[PDB]
């Protein structure tokens, strides 16, 4: 199976965004975070972030940000692939999330979203 | 004829998208994949991908991604040119596709799309 | 007059767009092409293209692509400046066009588009 | 707590935007500045700016500009994190403010915006 | 006062836009030009341009272009800051404009636009 694609939430909507600049561990960073809803269902796995110069995958900062902003605009159904327990900055983890955003795929029905499933 | 333009599907719509980051073969990659339908019907050749640091044509990652997102938004009729049997990562081919996306052109009628035919 | 601004069509609409990647003449390229509307016909006329690593003006590939996509979306009337007889790859010229896209300007009326004119 | 995240205004709207190029202190700059409202309420903390080659955080100019422009388009409620007393150019400070823009987060309700509140 | 911010036109709309490529002085350039109106009136200062590799401020070409395109799309009221007598190639000035685009700010009402204003009636 694809490394880092094993943990996801499906048929969610991106209902909040954050974008900022921040010094972390003595390095100048950019970050963004997505916040999620699942229609009217309560979701606890509801935030994930990406940082330009830290993480398991530094590539794709601008493309992932633009992709997140696209689905915030449409409110469309997506699946979010993420990795738990990534961010080591304790102030960032408590403010935003520990989770690193890995991929965003669309869902065309209540049962199908693109990408691998477990 | 144009090299790599011999294999295409016409009058389709991009009805799904994926964008992600992924380690493949020791390289840090970005990728995106488009999912297709043919009007009211599903089609069997229905996913094509592009990878920033692998493939027959590594250029144009951001422009092809922006172009794909554009037609996902409009739902317009397009022709997709693609190349078969490209991606060699077995986990990736199984989750997404083995096909490399080459070009996207528009269709102004049920019978005409821009670009060369065979 | 401005070099490369002598040849244009005014008050046209872009009704088709192509974007691709392609190996031409030993180089890896990106290109896009616009097709122009002719009455109610589906087939476009006067297609014009831009290539990132070939042409009289290699600069501005992404900005010209985004400008072309913009007017394809709005369907607005534009003036297109282009250079005839540029592309030499025969397969490309047969598939798309020989013309290089130089500039796109708006038309605010049936009578006025921005940019220089010739008589 | 996150350094530079202690000062913010919540549930505001970006109702004006400036973008320009400018020589400041012998350096060629770009800048943008956001103007804020909060519905009908009189606010005094209502302008924040970012400069490409000056400030505590020079990274993220284009991404922050595009983020500010998006919320100006939607008129949606946001939280603005900012740093007071940053700009030293007296002419710039008089025309806009001394405040450096740090982050923009969305507000999904009258009581919630993403990001830390301490 | 902010250098290069002394001449502007307020409460205008961008109602035309040009983008192109052009060779000048041995350099390959990109440029764009905006056309303006003041509601239903034509104005005297109605065009201004930015060039990627010429001008007093070469930075910000893409950001300025995207900003101008945005306001052309929305038709919203803006203030345009510009500098006179920059483009001195007569065929470019005849085709487009002599003025360099410096900044674009919004006007949220008929009475307010963002950005610096001159000190007084004589710009002392």
Numbering used by the authors:
A (entry chain B), B (entry chain A), D (entry chain E): 22 to 139
C (entry chain D): 22 to 140
E (entry chain C): 22 to 145
Lines from the paper:
Typhoid toxin is an A2B5 protein toxin and an important virulence factor for the human-adapted bacterial pathogen Salmonella enterica serovar Typhi, the causative agent of typhoid fever. Typhoid toxin contains two enzymatic subunits, PltA and CdtB, which dock onto a pentameric delivery platform composed of the protein PltB. It was recently reported that the same enzymatic subunits can assemble with a different delivery platform composed of the protein PltC, forming a distinct version of typhoid toxin. Here, we determined atomic-level structures of the pentameric PltC subunit, the fully assembled PltC typhoid toxin, and the PltC pentamers in complex with glycan receptors.
To gain insight into the molecular mechanism of the pentamerization of B subunits, we determined the crystal structure of the PltC homopentamer at a resolution of 1.33 Å and compared this to analogous structures of PltB and ArtB homopentamers solved previously. Close inspection of their oligomerization interfaces revealed that the monomers of PltC, PltB, and ArtB interact via similar structural elements—mainly loops L1 and L2, β strands β1, β2, and β5 and helix α1—to form a homopentamer. However, while there is appreciable overlap in the intersubunit interactions of ArtB and PltC, the specific residues and chemical interactions involved in the intersubunit interactions of the PltB homopentamer differ substantially. Electrostatic surface potential analysis of the interfaces of PltC-PltC, PltB-PltB, and ArtB-ArtB shows that it is mainly electrostatic interactions that facilitate subunit pentamerization. Importantly, the charge distribution of the PltB interface is substantially different from that of the PltC or ArtB interface. Consistent with our observations above that PltB and PltC do not interact, the interfaces between PltC and PltB exhibit significant electrostatic repulsion, most notably via D83PltC-E84PltB and E49PltC-E24PltB, which likely presents a substantial barrier to PltC-PltB complex formation. In contrast, the PltC-ArtB interface shows electrostatic attraction interactions, consistent with our observations that these proteins can form heteropentamers. Together, these results indicate that S. Typhi produces distinct PltB and PltC versions of typhoid toxin and that electrostatic repulsion at the subunit interface likely plays a major role in preventing the formation of heteromeric delivery platforms.
